[PDB]
Symmetry: C5
Amino acid sequence: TPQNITDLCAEYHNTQIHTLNDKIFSYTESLAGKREMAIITFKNGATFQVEVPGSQHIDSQKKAIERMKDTLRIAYLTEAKVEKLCVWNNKTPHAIAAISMAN
Amino acid sequence: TPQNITDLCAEYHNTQIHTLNDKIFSYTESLAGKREMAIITFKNGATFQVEVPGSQHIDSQKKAIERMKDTLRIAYLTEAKVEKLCVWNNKTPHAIAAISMAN
Amino acid sequence: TPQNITDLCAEYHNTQIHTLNDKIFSYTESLAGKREMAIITFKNGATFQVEVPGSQHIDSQKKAIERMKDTLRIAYLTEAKVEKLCVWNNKTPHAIAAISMAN
Amino acid sequence: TPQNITDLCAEYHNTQIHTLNDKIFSYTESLAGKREMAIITFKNGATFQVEVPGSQHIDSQKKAIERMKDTLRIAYLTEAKVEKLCVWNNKTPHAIAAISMAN
Amino acid sequence: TPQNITDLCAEYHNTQIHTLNDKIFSYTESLAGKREMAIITFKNGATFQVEVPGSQHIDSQKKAIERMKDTLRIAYLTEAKVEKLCVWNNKTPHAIAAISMAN
Ligand SMILES: CCNC1C(=O)C(=O)C1NC(COC(=O)NCCCCCC(=O)N[C@@H]1O[C@H](CO)[C@H](O)[C@H](O)[C@H]1O)COC(=O)NCCCCCC(=O)N[C@@H]1O[C@H](CO)[C@H](O)[C@H](O)[C@H]1O
Ligand SMILES: COC(=O)NCCCCCC(=O)N[C@@H]1O[C@H](CO)[C@H](O)[C@H](O)[C@H]1O
Ligand SMILES: COC(=O)NCCCCCC(=O)N[C@@H]1O[C@H](CO)[C@H](O)[C@H](O)[C@H]1O
Ligand SMILES: COC(=O)NCCCCCC(=O)N[C@@H]1O[C@H](CO)[C@H](O)[C@H](O)[C@H]1O
Ligand SMILES: CCNC1C(=O)C(=O)C1NC
């Protein structure tokens, strides 16, 4: 299995790594119908989403999407430094596939 | 997808943005039948609810309503500044649709 | 919907408000069969329970009872001041219906 | 209902109170098959388990077992003093039925 | 049942104990399809995974897999010392079976 987020990200099409090495600057979450999603930004302005669950997701990703939003909220609150994000770049904002945290 | 809470709010009828830039002053939660909801206030008296789940909501919103109540509780206990709330203004207290947190 | 815990409490029979304005002195939780409950106390000796889910509870209350125990746990560990409790005073210990936290 | 852990404990057979008045020294958790359990120890060497869910447990206990492991984890990480444990003493290590935290 | 992680680890084939006695250096999690997993590293370079739920796991392990990722995340964020990891060494990175935390 992948040793790290870079190797993981390279298993998928339409993905790229973002190297932030910074805490999350803003955390937004919505319960509005058809927009049950989270959005994060970094101080430089870069913005990322956790997509609404949809037909592009297999069933096993549903639990992981929920975990990711949990992760991002606690990371935000604790000011944890985000090392990298693996994202799908065929979406706007780019859609988070994975996160790594390291100080 | 929207890039921010103001753009997400504009996708819906009966909504408005409240810009708080302050921590939550009080957090109330109830398990009473037909009033399984949360209510928050800010120092200025502005009061908001997470609605009881009902026939207005679609299935995808159920998990999101639960997550929002989680978010408000931890925001309250950590003293996190709430930047904005997107709310439906056809309810009293105004009903939370989305929240943004920023330093 | 109610704007605050006092008005919420007044919608129900057999309830009262307790004003504590104090942190929780003790937190107790059990997984013993038929006693899957939580008990909290304050330094003045006031004792409250989160009832075991029963026939008095409607389906919508189930997730809220679980959330309440979550809330009491974290409130205890963070030493959060409890403002008021809305309780059913037709049970001993009085049974928690709602909680407000402020100050 | 019981007002405290000692009275609760006394409603069951094969139980005893252990008085710790101390934080948890170690926390261990496993996902290995048939050993999906938690183990905690105290600096006096006392060791306790949250048992693997089994045929002895009624349905209402399943959620409470999960909650207890959540509680022990957070108690460990926050260095919360454990007052007492109600345990079943017909298991080795003794099996937790209830926990009280104070002081 | 086992009283500690070493004894629990010994009950399984293809396992070994790693003694870290250190906080987690990095925490990675993914929601990408078929890679819904977590990876952790330590400053000595040691890398470990929580495997994707698969046909090697029994039902009872599914909740525990989810709990382990929760535990790792919060351990990382609180800089909790990890004492030992019980792992399967027939996977690369070695796959976490159990964790012990102690001061
Ligand atoms: C009802 C299913 N039984 C059991 C349990 O849940 C449990 O522990 C059960 N049985 C225990 C072990 O019993 C035996 O070893 N029995 C076999 C040997 C018996 C020799 C006698 C014999 O041959 N009798 C013959 O039996 C035949 C039928 O086979 C005929 O009837 C014939 O007529 C007769 O002569 C016994 O354990 C107890 O005494 N236990 C206390 C009660 C436990 C009830 C459930 C419970 O509350 N368990 C508790 O759950 C907690 C979690 O909620 C904790 O896990 C506690 O540790 C746990 O006790
Ligand atoms: C005996 O078991 C039951 O079915 N009781 C149900 C009768 C109808 C329930 C009426 C009711 O509102 N009970 C009330 O429920 C509350 C929980 O929601 C509290 O437990 C109050 O103490 C109880 O008076
Ligand atoms: C984790 O491994 C297990 O719990 N079980 C697998 C061990 C079984 C391998 C050896 C084997 O095939 N034993 C065979 O089991 C069969 C049932 O399946 C029959 O009882 C055979 O008589 C026995 O020789
Ligand atoms: C023994 O009987 C069972 O209940 N079997 C269920 C299937 C699992 C048997 C094979 C097995 O033990 N695989 C082992 O699973 C572990 C997870 O639990 C790890 O993935 C190990 O790398 C793998 O070798
Ligand atoms: C059939 C003999 N037994 C086994 C085998 O082959 C395995 O692998 C076994 N069990 C752990």
